[PDB]
Amino acid sequence: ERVVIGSKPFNEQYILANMIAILLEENGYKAEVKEGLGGTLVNYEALKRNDIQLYVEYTGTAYNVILRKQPPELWDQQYIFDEVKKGLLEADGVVVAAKLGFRDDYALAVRADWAEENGVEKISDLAEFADQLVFGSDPEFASRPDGLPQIKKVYGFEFKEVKQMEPTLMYEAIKNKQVDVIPAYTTDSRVDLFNLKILEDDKGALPPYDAIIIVNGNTAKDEKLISVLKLLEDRIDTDTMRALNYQYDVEKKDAREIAMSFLKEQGLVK
Ligand SMILES: [Cl-]
Ligand SMILES: [Cl-]
Ligand SMILES: [Mg+2]
Numbered sequence: 316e317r318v319v320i321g322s323k324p325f326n327e328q329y330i331l332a333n334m335i336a337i338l339l340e341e342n343g344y345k346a347e348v349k350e351g352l353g354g355t356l357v358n359y360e361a362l363k364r365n366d367i368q369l370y371v372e373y374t375g376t377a378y379n380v381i382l383r384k385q386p387p388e389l390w391d392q393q394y395i396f397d398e399v400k401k402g403l404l405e406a407d408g409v410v411v412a413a414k415l416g417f418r419d420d421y422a423l424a425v426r427a428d429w430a431e432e433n434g435v436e437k438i439s440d441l442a443e444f445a446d447q448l449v450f451g452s453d454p455e456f457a458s459r460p461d462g463l464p465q466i467k468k469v470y471g472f473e474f475k476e477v478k479q480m481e482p483t484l485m486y487e488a489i490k491n492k493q494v495d496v497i498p499a500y501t502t503d504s505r506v507d508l509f510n511l512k513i514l515e516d517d518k519g520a521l522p523p524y525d526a527i528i529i530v531n532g533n534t535a536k537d538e539k540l541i542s543v544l545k546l547l548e549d550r551i552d553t554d555t556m557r558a559l560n561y562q563y564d565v566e567k568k569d570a571r572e573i574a575m576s577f578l579k580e581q582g583l584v585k
Contacts, residue, residue: 318346331574339543352367373524384402416548420516426490450495451495506557
């Protein structure tokens with residue numbers, strides 16, 4: 316029978332949902348994509364009902380929004396993945412078919428040239444420079460307990476200055492050197508456009524958002540279908556996903572053609 320794939324209404328989701336569909340069709344299934352079906356719980360409730368068979372979720376989103384679990388003091392990638400896999404199965408029979416290989420986290424970003432010059436790769440590397448750096452922050456992230464205050468508590472430093480600004484011209488602000496550090500999503504195409512580097516949250520101040528294919532419980536008992544999905548296991552790292560999003564956002568390529576090119580290059584299709 317047809318396999319209907321859900322998606323949330325943005326770039327990465329359009330690309331991955333079409334990717335899964337193309338791979339399934341190459342392997343004998345008929346597939347349909349519902350692009351931009353809705354948000355997290357629109358998709359998840361659809362998945363429980365079998366109105367869709369699968370979609371791409373993120374571990375931290377499942378932990379916080381689907382399962383509504385109490386946040387830990389420090390966030391560990393593996394522990395959150397484990398609690399989400401166990402929690403989705405226990406609650407609704409939903410199966411984690413595959414980790415895709417990338418994270419779409421809220422992270423700290425700096426200019427790449429500056430990071431390269433100073434050997435900076437992770438958030439703890441900023442401590443030495445923090446009293447020289449300007450942080451650019453929307454007001455909510457600077458004030459709320461699990462934003463800037465959490466980073467400061469976990470990492471034990473403060474910046475020279477905090478400039479309040481809304482996200483619309485924030486990449487412009489870091490490019491123009493108004494600020495030196497901003498919060499950014501790790502797969503945002505603008506991180507490539509504006510030549511920034513994402514920093515590793517090495518002490519776990521912020522949640523992890525590992526991309527996972529999740530599947531209706533009964534759909535998941537089809538071992539042929541599961542085997543096809545596992546062909547994407549660990550296939551797409553964060554750098555790659557960001558580059559695919561760039562194709563969509565900057566190069567104006569369509570989601571299906573982005574997805575198709577990738578699978579063809581990998582030898583998964585043709
Ligand atoms: Cl929703
Ligand atoms: Cl969340
Ligand atoms: Mg790259």
